[PDB]
Design an enzyme around this catalytic site. Structure first.
Site, PDB file in Angstrom:
ATOM      1  CG  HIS A  24      -1.996  -0.946   1.077  1.00 56.57           C
ATOM      2  ND1 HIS A  24      -2.012  -2.147   1.704  1.00 56.57           N
ATOM      3  CD2 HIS A  24      -3.143  -0.976   0.245  1.00 56.57           C
ATOM      4  CE1 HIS A  24      -3.540  -2.742   1.531  1.00 56.57           C
ATOM      5  NE2 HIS A  24      -4.121  -2.192   0.476  1.00 56.57           N
ATOM      6  CG  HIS A  46      -7.562   4.033  -3.555  1.00 54.46           C
ATOM      7  ND1 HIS A  46      -6.660   4.293  -4.539  1.00 54.46           N
ATOM      8  CD2 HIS A  46      -7.524   2.600  -3.085  1.00 54.46           C
ATOM      9  CE1 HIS A  46      -6.139   3.135  -4.685  1.00 54.46           C
ATOM     10  NE2 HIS A  46      -6.669   2.162  -3.811  1.00 54.46           N
ATOM     11  CG  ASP A  47      -5.047   1.971  -0.444  1.00 49.14           C
ATOM     12  OD1 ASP A  47      -6.127   1.912   0.382  1.00 49.14           O
ATOM     13  OD2 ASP A  47      -4.922   1.165  -1.341  1.00 49.14           O
ATOM     14  CG  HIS A  70      -2.005  -0.007  -4.363  1.00 48.54           C
ATOM     15  ND1 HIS A  70      -2.654  -1.031  -5.031  1.00 48.54           N
ATOM     16  CD2 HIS A  70      -3.080   0.378  -3.548  1.00 48.54           C
ATOM     17  CE1 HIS A  70      -3.793  -0.976  -4.825  1.00 48.54           C
ATOM     18  NE2 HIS A  70      -4.247  -0.276  -3.957  1.00 48.54           N
ATOM     19  CG  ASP A  94      -8.270  -1.046  -4.327  1.00 46.17           C
ATOM     20  OD1 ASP A  94      -7.280  -0.706  -4.411  1.00 46.17           O
ATOM     21  OD2 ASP A  94      -9.017  -0.799  -3.367  1.00 46.17           O
TER      22      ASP A  94
HETATM   23  C1  LIG Z   1      -6.163  -5.709   2.246  1.00 42.10           C
HETATM   24  O1  LIG Z   1      -6.685  -6.017   1.114  1.00 42.10           O
HETATM   25  C2  LIG Z   1      -6.141  -5.223  -0.109  1.00 42.10           C
HETATM   26  C3  LIG Z   1      -6.733  -5.711  -1.343  1.00 42.10           C
HETATM   27  N1  LIG Z   1      -6.324  -7.007  -1.551  1.00 42.10           N
HETATM   28  C4  LIG Z   1      -5.920  -7.595  -2.712  1.00 42.10           C
HETATM   29  O2  LIG Z   1      -5.505  -6.863  -3.715  1.00 42.10           O
HETATM   30  N2  LIG Z   1      -5.509  -8.739  -2.690  1.00 42.10           N
HETATM   31  C5  LIG Z   1      -4.658  -9.319  -3.872  1.00 42.10           C
HETATM   32  C6  LIG Z   1      -3.926 -10.848  -3.918  1.00 42.10           C
HETATM   33  O3  LIG Z   1      -3.451 -11.051  -4.603  1.00 42.10           O
HETATM   34  N3  LIG Z   1      -4.266 -11.429  -2.408  1.00 42.10           N
HETATM   35  C7  LIG Z   1      -5.333 -10.973  -1.570  1.00 42.10           C
HETATM   36  C8  LIG Z   1      -5.531 -11.919  -0.428  1.00 42.10           C
HETATM   37  C9  LIG Z   1      -6.517 -11.619   0.611  1.00 42.10           C
HETATM   38  O4  LIG Z   1      -6.849 -12.275   1.377  1.00 42.10           O
HETATM   39  C10 LIG Z   1      -6.637 -13.814   1.498  1.00 42.10           C
HETATM   40  C11 LIG Z   1      -7.001 -10.359   0.309  1.00 42.10           C
HETATM   41  N4  LIG Z   1      -6.602  -9.285  -0.653  1.00 42.10           N
HETATM   42  C12 LIG Z   1      -5.892  -9.670  -1.363  1.00 42.10           C
HETATM   43  C13 LIG Z   1      -8.193  -5.487  -1.328  1.00 42.10           C
HETATM   44  C14 LIG Z   1      -8.478  -4.042  -1.715  1.00 42.10           C
HETATM   45  C15 LIG Z   1      -9.899  -3.683  -1.675  1.00 42.10           C
HETATM   46  C16 LIG Z   1     -10.852  -4.920  -1.658  1.00 42.10           C
HETATM   47  O5  LIG Z   1     -12.199  -4.631  -1.626  1.00 42.10           O
HETATM   48  C17 LIG Z   1     -12.656  -4.545  -2.932  1.00 42.10           C
HETATM   49  F1  LIG Z   1     -12.628  -5.977  -3.511  1.00 42.10           F
HETATM   50  F2  LIG Z   1     -14.056  -4.496  -2.494  1.00 42.10           F
HETATM   51  F3  LIG Z   1     -12.342  -3.734  -3.877  1.00 42.10           F
HETATM   52  C18 LIG Z   1     -10.338  -6.204  -1.537  1.00 42.10           C
HETATM   53  F4  LIG Z   1     -11.506  -6.941  -1.218  1.00 42.10           F
HETATM   54  C19 LIG Z   1      -9.054  -6.489  -1.474  1.00 42.10           C
HETATM   55 MG   LIG Z   2      -7.739   0.619   0.628  1.00 41.06          MG
HETATM   56 ZN   LIG Z   3      -5.910   0.012  -2.827  1.00 38.78          ZN
END
Ligand SMILES: COC[C@@H](NC(=O)N1CC(=O)Nc2cc(OC)cnc21)c1ccc(OC(F)(F)F)c(F)c1
Ligand SMILES: [Mg+2]
Ligand SMILES: [Zn+2]
Ligand SMILES: COC[C@@H](NC(=O)N1CC(=O)Nc2cc(OC)cnc21)c1ccc(OC(F)(F)F)c(F)c1
Ligand SMILES: [Mg+2]
Ligand SMILES: [Zn+2]
Lengths: 311, 334
Positions: free
Chosen positions: A67, A107-108, A71, A203
């Site tokens: 983050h 956004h972050d 990103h 995102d």
């Molecule tokens: C802290 O999370 C950041 C980001 N997560 C992400 O990119 N990844 C990528 C990856 O490769 N592994 C991951 C594993 C995991 O747990 C098993 C969770 N997230 C990820 C995220 C942002 C907005 C979100 O909200 C919405 F989806 F709504 F946009 C969302 F769900 C997730």
């Molecule tokens: Mg965020």
């Molecule tokens: Zn983000």
């Protein structure tokens, strides 16, 4: 301000990986993208104000593994790609599209590599964006009408809040309804819903590139999660399984994330825009790839340590 | 000088538990192992029985030690540990009720010599690598085991090292035939050929007047000594497993460099250690100690420790699945 073609011949393609661009060129690329979408002339943005705004936004990111500014730049770049490839001006107002792109940059803001454990972080991100705008020389909207300034702030707030997964899950039923009945440019509810969907699409855009990008981004995500988990153990608390480096099994967690969160987002995007079919197919292909390499999380031979002491 | 000018320790003074099946001979410092060999021969009474010249015996033991190289597993400490187990079998199973004194003496000397000049590589590697040992022994099978025996013979015919130079012509010959047969029995291929015969012998019962049964028992006991690390605690089996796989994967690396395709268990990119250990233990080690138990009821604790060590390999299997990120802290390996 560089023309966008001079940054890279593939810069407006879905196959381009914005993390390939050196970090020192990303501020200029932001300006080039706004120039190419014509928002600088459309809204009569003062260029020095815009340059200072962009540097302040960049400066407002910290350096955790995922983050960070790169990103935010990557997410912003995907918004540009959606503009260029999905013809967003046929679905949304110019001010809505402009708001989405600025929201992508912001956004972050000030993320610490730690999660919400509503929408605590997303409200902070918005408040940081507001604090940048009210810094001397950084208010890119200070010449907007009272109507348009207000609209812009409401859009940024709504769009940034839509990056909380909890928000996305609340509205998911509404997004599906919209996809099946079909988008209606005269329905203001549909504009709101589409902006949320597009923001989440931006995102998670690292999932739409090649295997090399998903693998690296996964690594950075888990690095953040396990740092948080380490800190939670040091304070006496019990971290979630996915934050605990001794319990998290990455293939199961990635495949869940991709089946349950990422793929349905790009499936919805595909249902609304047929030209986004290649995005959904790349995410699905990347999920298949996670399944193929799952077996490699069993240690074959001896560990790199060259020792069995860990038993 | 140090082996000579220290006199021969009584075995109780080395450790109060020295004659127990629970004692781990790898605990003894390497510099004390030569003296411990002498103490074991003294306590089994072979020095007085066969009128062995002590200086000759001291020099023989140092030459045997010197004849081991330093790969991870097949080094002097392995040979010492195997010899120590032979001593334990003498002390705990009352081997003098089953075998002749010269057979038991031959078994112990064979234990000391049975992996002489081992290079951390197996029989097929000699043939694949076209080594000098393969040139000499490949048409006869058991390439390494024949070399081990030839090295033992060369030590005996070194000046001042012939512990049997006062033996009768009959007994000298018998001793050499025993050492050869016993050392050749350390090839797994040999053990698998005779396994049906060992089972027959265990069920009908041992017969002290059957000379075939003596031969078979010596092979069984030798293999029991060779795999004795499996009869100690978890700490020993884990460490020995580590050393074994280190050797196997070095060999596998060498086989890849020559263009050949190594066996799964030699290939560090394909070998899954829990499956291989459990196979080794269910199919090789446990039946050896089951057979030993069937012949000697006092060896029941040996079989039960091997079985418990196998249960322990099953319990820790789950730990070979990478949780979190690798120690690397990187996902590049995908
Ligand atoms: C802290 O999370 C950041 C980001 N997560 C992400 O990119 N990844 C990528 C990856 O490769 N592994 C991951 C594993 C995991 O747990 C098993 C969770 N997230 C990820 C995220 C942002 C907005 C979100 O909200 C919405 F989806 F709504 F946009 C969302 F769900 C997730
Ligand atoms: Mg965020
Ligand atoms: Zn983000
Ligand atoms: C080069 O082999 C050395 C030795 N192996 C050994 O001790 N270990 C121990 C361990 O922890 N893992 C193992 C796993 C494995 O396969 C994956 C094979 N061997 C072992 C050995 C000697 C004589 C033998 O023949 C007979 F048993 F007959 F004496 C015999 F089978 C095996
Ligand atoms: Mg051997
Ligand atoms: Zn051996």
């Amino acid at each position: 301000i560089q023309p966008v073609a001079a940054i890279d011949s593939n810069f407006a393609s879905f196959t381009y990986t914005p993390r390939s661009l050196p970090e020192d060129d990303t501020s200029m690329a932001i300006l080039s993208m706004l120039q190419d979408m014509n928002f600088i002339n459309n809204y009569k943005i003062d260029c020095p104000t815009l340059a200072r705004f962009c540097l302040m936004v960049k400066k407002g990111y910290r350096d955790p593994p995922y983050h960070n500014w790169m990103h935010a730049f990557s997410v912003s770049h995907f918004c540009y790609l959606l503009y260029k490839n999905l013809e967003l001006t046929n679905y949304l107002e110019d001010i809505e599209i402009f708001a989405l792109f600025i929201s992508c940059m912001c956004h972050d803001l000030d993320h610490r590599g730690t999660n919400n454990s509503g929408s605590v972080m997303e409200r902070h991100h918005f408040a940081q964006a507001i604090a940048i705008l009210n810094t001397h020389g950084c208010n890119i909207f200070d010449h907007f009408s009272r109507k348009d300034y207000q609209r812009m702030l409401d859009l940024m707030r709504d769009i940034i809040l839509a990056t909380d997964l909890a928000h996305h899950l609340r509205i998911f039923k509404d997004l599906q309804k919209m996809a099946e009945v079909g988008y209606d440019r005269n329905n203001k509810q549909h504009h709101r819903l589409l902006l949320c969907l597009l923001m989440t699409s931006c995102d998670l855009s690292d999932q739409t590139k090649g295997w090399k990008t998903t693998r690296k981004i996964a690594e950075l995500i888990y690095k953040e999660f396990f740092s948080q988990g380490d800190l939670e153990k040091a304070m006496g608390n019990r971290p979630m399984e996915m934050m605990d480096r001794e319990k998290a099994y990455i293939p199961e967690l990635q495949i869940s994330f991709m089946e349950h969160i990422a793929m349905p987002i790009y499936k919805l995007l595909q249902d609304l825009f047929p030209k986004a079919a290649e995005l959904y197919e790349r995410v699905a292909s990347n999920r298949e790839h996670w399944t193929k390499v799952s077996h490699k999380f069993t240690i074959r031979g001896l560990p790199s340590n060259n020792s069995l002491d860990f038993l």
